[PDB]
Scaffold this active site. Structure first.
Site, mmCIF file in Angstrom:
data_model
loop_
_atom_site.group_PDB
_atom_site.id
_atom_site.type_symbol
_atom_site.label_atom_id
_atom_site.label_comp_id
_atom_site.label_asym_id
_atom_site.label_seq_id
_atom_site.Cartn_x
_atom_site.Cartn_y
_atom_site.Cartn_z
ATOM 1 N N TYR A 181 -1.543 -6.368 -3.565
ATOM 2 C CA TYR A 181 -0.829 -6.807 -2.384
ATOM 3 C C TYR A 181 -1.541 -7.981 -1.728
ATOM 4 O O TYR A 181 -0.932 -9.024 -1.490
ATOM 5 C CB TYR A 181 -0.685 -5.639 -1.397
ATOM 6 C CG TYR A 181 -0.011 -6.000 -0.087
ATOM 7 C CD1 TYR A 181 1.367 -5.968 0.034
ATOM 8 C CD2 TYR A 181 -0.756 -6.361 1.027
ATOM 9 C CE1 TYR A 181 1.988 -6.291 1.223
ATOM 10 C CE2 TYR A 181 -0.143 -6.691 2.229
ATOM 11 C CZ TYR A 181 1.231 -6.654 2.316
ATOM 12 O OH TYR A 181 1.865 -6.975 3.493
ATOM 13 N N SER A 194 0.460 -11.771 5.113
ATOM 14 C CA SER A 194 -0.430 -10.726 5.610
ATOM 15 C C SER A 194 -1.832 -11.275 5.883
ATOM 16 O O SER A 194 -2.229 -12.306 5.337
ATOM 17 C CB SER A 194 -0.509 -9.575 4.607
ATOM 18 O OG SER A 194 -1.510 -8.635 4.957
#
Lengths: 235, 235
Positions: free
Chosen positions: A155, A142
């Site tokens: 995350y 990400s």
């Protein structure tokens, strides 16, 4: 182009994982859909067979290290060899204030987004090396991996490690003719799953370390990194 | 300056941790040495008391979440309040080819260098917020956190997450008057433990996000980041 390549895709029963199954499959790759939702796997592989892609389904929680080992055996049983392409695409997230984060929040999110990919790397890397074949490994991480955030703290952190870990495996595995990439989508209107899939297949062909198909983020990424450089003590 | 501040330092029985105990203590801070080696803790706190620093020792494996909770209670029992300064300095490493890495390699190294700091953050952050006092949190990560490596793959990856995670907690905790920093030493002749300690105390005073007291690394860090920026797709 990918004819007689075998591809093991986590979180492949959906989203970017599935997009990859389709894209690599249309290019000739034999596919292994690894995902946890057994019903979704069944659907997904059918839809692949429906597209003339040879495909096998495996229901698997990647956080289970032994099941990950069973699958890898299964893959060699079914297609008579270890994969030549590994994609760690599986991901999960939940939003909320980083201060409020709990152990279960961490375990779950770190477990999928980091430990899941470690288990993948530990499982397959030796088998891929022992095959003596060229190969490649992608991790869909990400953009948040490049910048920690208050609402996606856990995350972002796990993705930050997968990026780095891929940076490390690339260096390690080059001597084995095994490339390594990391894809960092901008998930902080939005790039389509098949669009992103084609970007990854290109990155695999190009043997690119980074796959960042989002021209818009350049400014912010430059800014985040400069702040770091500026923090470096004189002289 | 740090008079009537309480400081909880992991891996404080040695190296950078201990340097911090000394530096913050000489500035007036009450100190809590948390380290796993019980003998080294005993020595370290003595040496601190020998310097006129009020200091308490706690033997603690930070990977144990419940013991980390006991300690935090202990801290409030002894000094009548939760810490106002947290330092996650504890670190471990072992070198070797990233391909050869094992689950135990990972668990141990990820466990200390990442999970250890998560346990620290989950344990103290609520207590620090509930105190309603200003505070600050440092994590001694690593420069390897900014760049994955073939010989310190696991370590670099965990440090990459702690950096990011601090980036995230900074954003979260500013509204609570709690600063957050991350220190990234160059451990890939070398900056002395007390030298680095003073750099951290300065960073704490300055409320700096990054503490990179190594003017030499600037070139390489610029280069590593540019490679990323250059990977960003046109247009």
């Amino acid at each position: 182009d990918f004819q007689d390549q075998v591809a093991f895709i986590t979180g492949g029963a959906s989203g970017a994982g599935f997009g990859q199954a389709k894209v690599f499959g249309q290019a000739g790759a034999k596919i292994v859909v690894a995902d946890v939702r057994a019903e979704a796997v069944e659907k997904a592989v059918a839809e692949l067979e429906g597209l003339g892609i040879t495909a096998h389904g495996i229901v698997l929680d990647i956080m289970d290290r032994e099941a990950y080992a069973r699958a890898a055996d299964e893959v060699e049983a079914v297609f008579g060899q270890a994969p030549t392409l590994l994609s760690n695409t599986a991901g999960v997230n939940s939003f909320g204030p980083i201060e409020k984060t709990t152990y279960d929040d961490f375990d779950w999110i770190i477990g999928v987004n980091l430990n899941g990919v470690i288990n993948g790397m530990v499982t397959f890397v030796p088998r891929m090396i022992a095959s003596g074949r060229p190969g490649h490994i992608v991790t869909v991480s990400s953009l948040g991996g490049f910048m920690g955030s208050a609402l996606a703290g856990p995350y972002s952190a796990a993705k930050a490690a997968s990026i780095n870990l891929m940076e490390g495996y690339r260096q390690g595995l080059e001597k084995y003719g095994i490339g390594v990439s990391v894809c960092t989508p901008a998930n902080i209107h939005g790039l389509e799953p098949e669009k992103l899939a084609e970007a990854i297949k290109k990155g695999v062909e190009d043997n690119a370390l980074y796959i960042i198909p989002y021209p818009e983020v350049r400014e912010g990424l430059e800014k985040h990194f400069q702040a770091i450089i500026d923090s470096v003590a004189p002289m």
